[PDB]
Amino acid sequence: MKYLPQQDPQVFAAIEQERKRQHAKIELIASENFVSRAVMEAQGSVLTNKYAEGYPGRRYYGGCEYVDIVEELARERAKQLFGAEHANVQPHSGAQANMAVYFTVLEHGDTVLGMNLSHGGHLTHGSPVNFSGVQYNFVAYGVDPETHVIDYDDVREKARLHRPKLIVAAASAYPRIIDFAKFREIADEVGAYLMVDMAHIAGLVAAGLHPNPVPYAHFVTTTTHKTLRGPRGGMILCQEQFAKQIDKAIFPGIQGGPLMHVIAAKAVAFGEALQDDFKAYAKRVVDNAKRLASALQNEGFTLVSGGTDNHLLLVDLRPQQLTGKTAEKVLDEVGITVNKATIPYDPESPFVTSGIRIGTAAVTTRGFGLEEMDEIAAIIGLVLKNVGSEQALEEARQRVAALTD
Amino acid sequence: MKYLPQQDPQVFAAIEQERKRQHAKIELIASENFVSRAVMEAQGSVLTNKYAEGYPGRRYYGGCEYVDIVEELARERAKQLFGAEHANVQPHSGAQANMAVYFTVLEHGDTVLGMNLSHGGHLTHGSPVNFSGVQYNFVAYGVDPETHVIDYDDVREKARLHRPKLIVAAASAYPRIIDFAKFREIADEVGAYLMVDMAHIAGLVAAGLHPNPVPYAHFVTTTTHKTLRGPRGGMILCQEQFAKQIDKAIFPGIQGGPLMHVIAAKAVAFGEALQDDFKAYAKRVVDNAKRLASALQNEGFTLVSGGTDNHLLLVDLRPQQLTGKTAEKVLDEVGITVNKATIPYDPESPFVTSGIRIGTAAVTTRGFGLEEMDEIAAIIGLVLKNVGSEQALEEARQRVAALTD
Numbered sequence: 001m002k003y004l005p006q007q008d009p010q011v012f013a014a015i016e017q018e019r020k021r022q023h024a025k026i027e028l029i030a031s032e033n034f035v036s037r038a039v040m041e042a043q044g045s046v047l048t049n050k051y052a053e054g055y056p057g058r059r060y061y062g063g064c065e066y067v068d069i070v071e072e073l074a075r076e077r078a079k080q081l082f083g084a085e086h087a088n089v090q091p092h093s094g095a096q097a098n099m100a101v102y103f104t105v106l107e108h109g110d111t112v113l114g115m116n117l118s119h120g121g122h123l124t125h126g127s128p129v130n131f132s133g134v135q136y137n138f139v140a141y142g143v144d145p146e147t148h149v150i151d152y153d154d155v156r157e158k159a160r161l162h163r164p165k166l167i168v169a170a171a172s173a174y175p176r177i178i179d180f181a182k183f184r185e186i187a188d189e190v191g192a193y194l195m196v197d198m199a200h201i202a203g204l205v206a207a208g209l210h211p212n213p214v215p216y217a218h219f220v221t222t223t224t225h226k227t228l229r230g231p232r233g234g235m236i237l238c239q240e241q242f243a244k245q246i247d248k249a250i251f252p253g254i255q256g257g258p259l260m261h262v263i264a265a266k267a268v269a270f271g272e273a274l275q276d277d278f279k280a281y282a283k284r285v286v287d288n289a290k291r292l293a294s295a296l297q298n299e300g301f302t303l304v305s306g307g308t309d310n311h312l313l314l315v316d317l318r319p320q321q322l323t324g325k326t327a328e329k330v331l332d333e334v335g336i337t338v339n340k341a342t343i344p345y346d347p348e349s350p351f352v353t354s355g356i357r358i359g360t361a362a363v364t365t366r367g368f369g370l371e372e373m374d375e376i377a378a379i380i381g382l383v384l385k386n387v388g389s390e391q392a393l394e395e396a397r398q399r400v401a402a403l404t405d
Numbered sequence: 406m407k408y409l410p411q412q413d414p415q416v417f418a419a420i421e422q423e424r425k426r427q428h429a430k431i432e433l434i435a436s437e438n439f440v441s442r443a444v445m446e447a448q449g450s451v452l453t454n455k456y457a458e459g460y461p462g463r464r465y466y467g468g469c470e471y472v473d474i475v476e477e478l479a480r481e482r483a484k485q486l487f488g489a490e491h492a493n494v495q496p497h498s499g500a501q502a503n504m505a506v507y508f509t510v511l512e513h514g515d516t517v518l519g520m521n522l523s524h525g526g527h528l529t530h531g532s533p534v535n536f537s538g539v540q541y542n543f544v545a546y547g548v549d550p551e552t553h554v555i556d557y558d559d560v561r562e563k564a565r566l567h568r569p570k571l572i573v574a575a576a577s578a579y580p581r582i583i584d585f586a587k588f589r590e591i592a593d594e595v596g597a598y599l600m601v602d603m604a605h606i607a608g609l610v611a612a613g614l615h616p617n618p619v620p621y622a623h624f625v626t627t628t629t630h631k632t633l634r635g636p637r638g639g640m641i642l643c644q645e646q647f648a649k650q651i652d653k654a655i656f657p658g659i660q661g662g663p664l665m666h667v668i669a670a671k672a673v674a675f676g677e678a679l680q681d682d683f684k685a686y687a688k689r690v691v692d693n694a695k696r697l698a699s700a701l702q703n704e705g706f707t708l709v710s711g712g713t714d715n716h717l718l719l720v721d722l723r724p725q726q727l728t729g730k731t732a733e734k735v736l737d738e739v740g741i742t743v744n745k746a747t748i749p750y751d752p753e754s755p756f757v758t759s760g761i762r763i764g765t766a767a768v769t770t771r772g773f774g775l776e777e778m779d780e781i782a783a784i785i786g787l788v789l790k791n792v793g794s795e796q797a798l799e800e801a802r803q804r805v806a807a808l809t810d
Contacts, residue, residue, distance in 0.1 A: 007443035008673050010478055018471040019451050029466060034454055038412035044449015046424050048637050061434060062737045066423040072778055073415055086751050092497035095661040108513050129657045190592060232664050254499040259637050264420060268413050290464045332467045339466065
C-alpha cells in the first residue's frame with residue numbers, strides 16, 4: 001500500500017495487524033480462505049465509483065459499457081464453471097442470494113423445508129431470529145442419530161406432511177456428500193421447488209469433487225468466498241425459465257446498485273477456478289480433510305458422521321467431557337482458530353455446544369499437505385488432552401509457530 | 406496494479422477502459438463520486454478473508470481483534486461526524502440499511518408513509534416492485550405542483566388519514582432542504598417513528614451545509630458512496646434506545662458476514678470527512694450546484710423548484726419539448742453523463758420522463774469550479790437546443806474534451 005499508511009495511520013496499523021495475524025495462525029474456520037492478489041486488486045479498483053443498477057446492456061445508468069463487460073465475464077465464467085443456464089453475480093452476500101430466491105418463489109408465511117439448524121442447516125435456512133424464519137414458515141429435516149447422515153425418509157415425510165412450497169438442501173456444517181437427486185425426487189413428489197445452497201462446497205463442485213446440484217435444483221445459491229476462494233459476496237444459478245424472475249428479485253426486488261468492483265473480483269476468482277491448478281488445489285483440500293479426520297481419530301477423537309467427504313469435519317467432544325466453547329477458547333490460546341459447533345442431537349445450547357467445526361480450505365491454500373494435517377491433529381490432541389497444563393499449551397504454541405514458519 | 410494484468414488480461418482490460426472513461430467523461434450522475442486511493446487500498450486489503458459475524462467484542466468467530474479495531478474506528482468516526490448515539494456500519498448497501506430499519510420496527514403489512522416516488526422518493530421507499538412496497542403498505546406525500554417543495558400539510562394529512570407506523574423522509578431527487586423538525590412534529594402527532602434516509606445529502610450534513618436529521622429522527626439511514634465520498638455500502642444511525650434492536654436487525658436479522666474490507670474503507674472515508682478540507686470540498690459542491698443551476702437558467706432552462714439548496718438539480722425539459730430519455734441519449738453522445746428523471750406531476754412514464762437529474766459532487770471532486778459550471782451549462786444548452794445538428798454535437802464533444810483535459 002502507498003496511500004493508506006499516510007492518509008490513515010490508525011486504519012493501516014489495524015490492517016497490518018490483521019495481515020500478520022492471517023500468516024501467524026492456523027486458520028481452521030471451515031468457511032474461510034485466502035484470496036489471490038489479483039482478486040484483491042480487482043476489489044481495490046475504481047469500479048467502486050460506478051452506479052450500475054440493472055443488468056449488462058439493460059442498465060438504468062449510462063456509461064456502463066465496461067462494467068457490463070466485467071459483469072458478463074463473471075456470468076459466463078460462472079456458467080462455464082457450473083453448467084448453469086443462468087447466473088446472477090450481483091448478490092451482496094450469501095444472505096442476499098438466499099433472500100432473493102425466497103423473494104422469487106415464496107409469499108409471506110409460505111412453508112419451507114430446510115435442514116435442521118442444529119444438524120448443519122444455516123441461519124438463513126429458517127432461524128427464528130433471521131428473516132427466513134420470521135418471514136416464512138420453516139420446518140426441518142434431520143440427520144440419523146447414529147450415522148449423522150441426512151435421513152432422506154425424514155426429508156420425504158416432513159415434505160409430505162407439511163407440503164412446503166420450497167425445499168432447501170445444503171449446509172454450513174455437514175461433512176458428507178448431499179444426494180441432490182433424492183432431494184429433487186422428494187420435491188417432485190410434493191410439487192415443491194428445490195433450492196440448493198452450495199456456499200460451503202462450491203469450489204469442490206467446480207472441481208468435480210462433489211456432485212453438482214445444478215442439474216437437479218431449480219435454484220442454486222452460493223457465496224463466492226468459501227471453497228470457491230473468491231471475494232466476499234453471493235451468486236444465484238438457475239434454469240433459463242427463472243432467469244427473468246431471479247434478476248428482478250435482486251433488482252429492483254431486494255438490492256440497489258451492485259458492487260461492480262466485487263463483481264470484477266468474482267470474475268477473477270471464477271477465472272482462477274477454471275484453471276487446472278484450482279482442480280489440483282480442491283483435491284488437496286478434500287485429501288487434507290480426510291487425512292486430518294483420520295489423524296484426529298488416531299488421536300482418540302470422535303468425528304460427527306465418522307469422517308468427511310468434503311472440506312470440513314466436526315469433532316464430537318463428549319468423550320473428552322469438553323464443550324465446543326472450552327475447546328475453541330484453549331485452541332485460540334495456542335494459535336489455532338476453530339469454531340464451536342452444535343453437533344446433531346447436541347445436549348448443550350448453541351452458545352456452548354459439544355463440538356468444534358474444522359475445515360482445510362485455508363491451510364491448503366497456504367500449501368499445507370498430509371504431513372501438516374498429521375501435525376495439526378497431534379497439536380489438537382496435545383491441547384485438548386491437557387487443557388490445564390500451561391507447559392503443554394506452550395509446546396503447542398511452539399509447534400503451531402513451526403508450521404506457519 | 407501488478408498481479409491482475411498477468412492473471413486476468415480480460416478483466417484488467419475492462420477495468421482500464423473504465424478508469425479511462427471516468428477521466429474522459431463529465432460525470433453528472435447525482436449519486437456518483439470519486440473515492441480516494443486510500444479508500445480503494447482499504448477495499449483491496451486482506452480483510453476480505455475474515456469472517457466476523459456479530460459485533461466488535463461480541464463476535465461469533467475468534468481472531469477478530471484487529472477487524473474489531475477497524476469496525477470501532479468506523480463507528481466512532483461516524484458518531485463524531487453526525488453526533489449520533491449509535492452507528493451500525495455493517496449494511497452492505499443503502500437497500501440493506503433501509504431493509505434493516507424496516508425489519509426493526511415494522512411487521513408485514515404495516516403502513517408506512519414515504520415521499521412520492523415520482524416527486525423524489527427512492528425505490529426502497531415503497532415501490533411496488535421493491536421489497537418495501539411488497540412487504541409493507543406504502544402511502545405517499547407529495548410536493549407542491551408549483552413550487553415543487555414538499556407540502557408539509559400533505560405530509561400531515563396523509564399521516565393523520567393513514568396512521569402509518571413509520572414515516573420516511575429523504576429523497577433521491579429532491580433539490581431543496583428537507584425540514585426534519587416538521588417531519589418529527591407530524592410523526593409525534595400520529596405516534597409514528599421517523600426514519601430519515603440521508604443517502605444523497607450525507608456529505609453535506611457532515612459539513613454543516615444541510616440540517617442534520619440525527620436529533621429529529623429515530624433512525625437515520627445512508628449510503629457511504631454519494632456526497633460522503635466513501636466506498637459503496639450502507640450505514641444506520643440511531644439513538645441508544647434502538648441500538649440493540651438495530652444491530653440484531655442487521656445480524657442475525659437480514660445479513661450474515663459483514664464486508665470487513667469495505668468497513669475499513671468506510672473508516673477511511675469517515676476520517677477524510679472529519680478533515681477541514683472535506684468541509685471546503687462540500688461547500689464547493691453546493692456552490693457549484695447553485696452556479697450550475699443559475700447558468701442553466703441563463704441558457705433558458707426551467708429547473709424543478711426553481712433551483713437547488715444542495716448537490717443536485719432537475720431540469721424540466723417540457724419548455725424545450727424534449728423527454729429526459731432524448732436528452733440523456735444525446736448528452737451521452739458528447740461525453741456528458743446524466744440521468745433521465747421523472748419531474749413532479751410528470752406526464753411521461755418513468756421510462757421516458759420529462760427531466761434530467763444532475764449533481765456536482767463528482768466534478769467538484771475532480772477540481773471543477775464556478776467557471777467550469779458556466780461552461781457545462783453552455784455545452785448542455787448547445788446540445789439540447791441543437792439535437793439534430795452533428796456539427797453542434799461535435800463542438801460540444803470538443804468542449805467536453807477541453808474540460809477533462
